[PDB]
Curated annotation (Swiss-Prot):
Positions bound to Ca(2+) 2: D53, G85, G87, D89
Residues noted as binding Zn(2+) 1 in the record, renumbered to the chain: H63, D65, H78, H91
Similarity comment: Belongs to the peptidase M10A family.
Name used for this protein in its record: Macrophage metalloelastase
Amino acid sequence: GPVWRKHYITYRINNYTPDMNREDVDYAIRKAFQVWSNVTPLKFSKINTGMADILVVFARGAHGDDHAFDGKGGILAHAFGPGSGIGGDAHFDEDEFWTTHSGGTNLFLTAVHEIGHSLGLGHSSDPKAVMFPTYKYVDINTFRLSADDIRGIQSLYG
Ligand SMILES: O=C(NCc1ccc(-c2ccccc2)cc1)[C@@H]1O[C@H]2CN(C(=O)NO)C[C@@H]1O2
Ligand SMILES: [Ca+2]
Ligand SMILES: [Ca+2]
Ligand SMILES: [Ca+2]
Ligand SMILES: [Zn+2]
Ligand SMILES: [Zn+2]
């Protein structure tokens, strides 16, 4: 499927969840991008205004893309593959309670998965992969991609 055809990729945080400190949202998202730039030639930069490749949005219920959220639980987030417009964008369900830790739903871990989609990855059947469909908390301080995730992303980039 589609991939980004350039190495410098921008993201913009459209709005911030009230669930977390602003700086913690910034850091979680930055770290999640870093997971993927660690294993590809991609470079990610946060921009404050204008058109970014990847728009990060927090929203609940119906939010303008025909892919409505479902309240607390269930769908935690979704993201669109590389392309113009909404392509690349990552949306996080505001009806979740986002955190920096094991409580609620961990933003960093969810963002690693969603950014995988923003870069062109689909779901993996391997329960050890970050691209596995099911959320399960793992210690964020020592988090690592599975071999399957690395094979997947490196088949697309680098
Ligand atoms: O948003 C999701 N998932 C995104 C997601 C997947 C995996 C991780 C993940 C977290 C930690 C480690 C590895 C992967 C994070 C977010 C949800 O998981 C599936 C099934 N599902 C569900 O059963 N919810 O109760 C709805 C939706 O689709
Ligand atoms: Ca939900
Ligand atoms: Ca976009
Ligand atoms: Ca919330
Ligand atoms: Zn959406
Ligand atoms: Zn997914």
